[PDB]
Design goal:
A: 300 residues, Serine Threonine Protein Phosphatase 5, Tetratricopeptide repeat, 3-stranded mixed beta sheet, B: Nucleotidyltransferase, domain 5, Acyl-CoA Binding Protein, 2 domains, binds 6-[(pyridin-2-yl)sulfanyl]pyridin-3-amine, Pre-mRNA-splicing factor 8 (chain B), AAR2_C (chain A), cytoplasm (chain A), AAR2_C_sf (chain A), nucleus (chain A)
Chain lengths: 300, 237
């Protein structure tokens, strides 16, 4: 288990760690989060009590360094930093635990939710989507746009997701126009899987990271990406069987974890109805269809 | 975006554009089989591609052989239309390629867009106009060449005859759509109106009769009567 200490909490803020969250009052004696499970990426996120505008946060893996949070009163936010003095870091952390100023990552032992939401997500790939190579962690916020959204403006502050465009020369082979538009298997299997992502795990890793940015930050471009990557699969007649089985498990836990009240803005009616009831894979997502029909039958 | 009554005069500016109508591409007769089931038999079709400023009509005949052994023919027909339009554009010198293609049915937008990815600068647009181009097969010389074809074939026609010598494209298109609207509403009455006077002939190189200016006024008025008429006989007014 690992720890992300906080220098202090000068402004009232709701803090999230993965799918948990808690309120910290202005100048409360809060010195961070302990007992964080090793072996998974994590995200630590913030929404100020005053300006609920801009949710923002940091993807990190404790195996990659000692990280802490410190408020910056000039830039006005909680910043993640790395401590290079390993000795200094354990001394700090131990003192805050003895004084019990830290919240404990509150994992129930039956609960595989976070694993299931991040199974294929890897820090190395996050850092390629969020470009800032001098830090081992990655900042995301609500307003960051995606490379495809910019083609349609600050390139240093973008989400470099894989561009998927169904009416593109990359997606459509000359002479196969009808075949390739109506059945996206060439685009999925040859262009994306073999060509770009190399394997289904990297594909699923981007899909899950896109979902998580949409849910935790309300990042619209991430939502667009998550739905695109589902639709590409759902609209391909020929998909490896293990991929469909895993996709059903991925989506199940995503729909399970979604806040009931945010479904109206995070779920694309057309994509879901298409995927579940019209597409080639309409009968292949049994777990996902069951949870969608029992939780969001209005959407369908 | 879409073409409608507000931006109607854009059809007669000097940007090259083409209407595409796919209504008559996939045509069938429905009939009973010996066992008393129903079956279709395809007949020849055509793509209706028209430049509204000049009257140049590229009539691409769709021979029934193109359907042989194919499934989901109504869907295929939209893609086949798009493939043939795309081939046509590719065959034209650059300075003759259209800047916009306007499709009369919204179901052609995606098929045409995909077949024209090579031409990102050609705008594919729908229209809110309810154009009567489906009635093109009520023009005897067009129907004849379509039905006579034994293979795929592109026939070239000027759908305005020589009208542009005497009237503007805006007026020529208005006349054309009035005629086709009338043919669409009551083909018999419409054709009676056009041919009643045997001294006004259709020239061998024309589609419509050689009416004088005065006679076109009379004709145009009679087609308006027809369309109002059938609008009562249909809505009891
Ligand atoms: N009778 C007739 C035949 C051809 C032409 S020239 C032309 C070229 C291309 C598309 C349409 N018409 N003009 C009149």
């Amino acid at each position: 288990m690992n720890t992300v200490p906080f220098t202090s909490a000068p402004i009232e803020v709701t803090i999230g760690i993965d799918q948990y969250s808690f309120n910290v009052k202005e100048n409360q004696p809060f010195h961070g989060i302990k007992d964080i499970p090793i072996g998974h990426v994590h995200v630590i996120h913030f929404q100020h009590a005053d300006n609920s505008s801009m949710r923002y946060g940091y993807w990190f893996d404790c195996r990659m360094g000692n990280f802490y949070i410190q408020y910056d009163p000039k830039d006005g936010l909680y910043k993640m930093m790395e401590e290079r003095d390993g000795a200094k870091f354990e001394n700090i952390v131990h003192n805050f635990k003895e004084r019990q100023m830290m919240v404990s990552y509150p994992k129930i032992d039956e609960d595989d939710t976070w694993y299931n939401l991040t199974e294929f997500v890897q820090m190395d790939k996050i850092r390629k989507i969020v470009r800032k190579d001098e830090n081992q962690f990655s900042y995301v916020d609500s307003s960051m746009t995606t490379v495809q959204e910019n083609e349609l403006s600050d390139p240093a502050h973008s989400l470099n997701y894989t561009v998927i465009n169904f009416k593109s020369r990359e997606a459509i082979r000359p002479g196969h126009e009808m075949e390739d538009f109506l059945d996206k298997s060439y685009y999925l299997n040859t262009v994306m899987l073999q060509g770009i992502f190399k394997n289904s795990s990297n594909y699923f890793g981007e899909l899950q990271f896109a979902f998580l940015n949409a849910m935790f930050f309300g990042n619209y471009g991430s939502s667009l990406q998550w739905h695109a990557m589902i639709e590409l699969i759902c609209s391909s007649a020929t998909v490896p069987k293990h991929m469909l089985d895993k996709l059903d498990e991925i989506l199940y836990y995503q729909i399970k974890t979604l806040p009931e009240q945010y479904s109206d803005i995070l779920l694309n009616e057309r994509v879901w109805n298409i995927c579940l009831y019209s597409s080639f894979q309409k009968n292949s997502l049994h777990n996902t269809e069951k949870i969608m029909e029992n939780k969001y039958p209005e959407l369908l | 975006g879409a073409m409608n009554s507000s931006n109607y005069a854009e059809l007669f500016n000097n940007d090259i554009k083409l209407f595409v109508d796919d209504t008559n591409v996939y045509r069938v007769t429905v009939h009973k089989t010996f066992e008393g089931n129903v079956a279709t038999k395809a007949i020849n079709g055509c793509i209706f591609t028209l430049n509204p400023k000049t009257g140049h009509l590229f009539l691409k005949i769709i021979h029934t052989s193109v359907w042989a052994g194919q499934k989901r023919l109504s869907q295929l027909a939209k893609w086949k239309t798009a493939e043939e339009v795309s081939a046509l554009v590719r065959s034209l010198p650059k300075e003759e390629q259209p800047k916009q293609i306007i499709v009369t049915r919204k179901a052609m937008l995606d098929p045409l867009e995909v077949h024209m990815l090579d031409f990102p600068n050609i705008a594919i647009r729908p229209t809110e106009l309810r154009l009567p181009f489906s009635a093109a097969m009520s023009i005897d010389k067009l129907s004849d060449v379509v039905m006579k074809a034994t293979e795929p074939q592109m026939v070239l026609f000027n759908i305005y005859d020589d009208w542009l010598d005497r009237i503007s494209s805006y007026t020529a298109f208005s006349r054309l759509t009035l005629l086709l609207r009338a043919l669409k509403t009551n083909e018999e009455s419409a054709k009676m109106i056009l041919l009643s006077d045997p001294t006004i002939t259709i020239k061998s190189y024309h589609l419509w009769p050689s009416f004088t200016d005065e006679q076109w006024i009379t004709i145009e008025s009679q087609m308006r009567d027809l369309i109002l008429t059938e609008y009562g006989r249909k809505y009891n007014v």
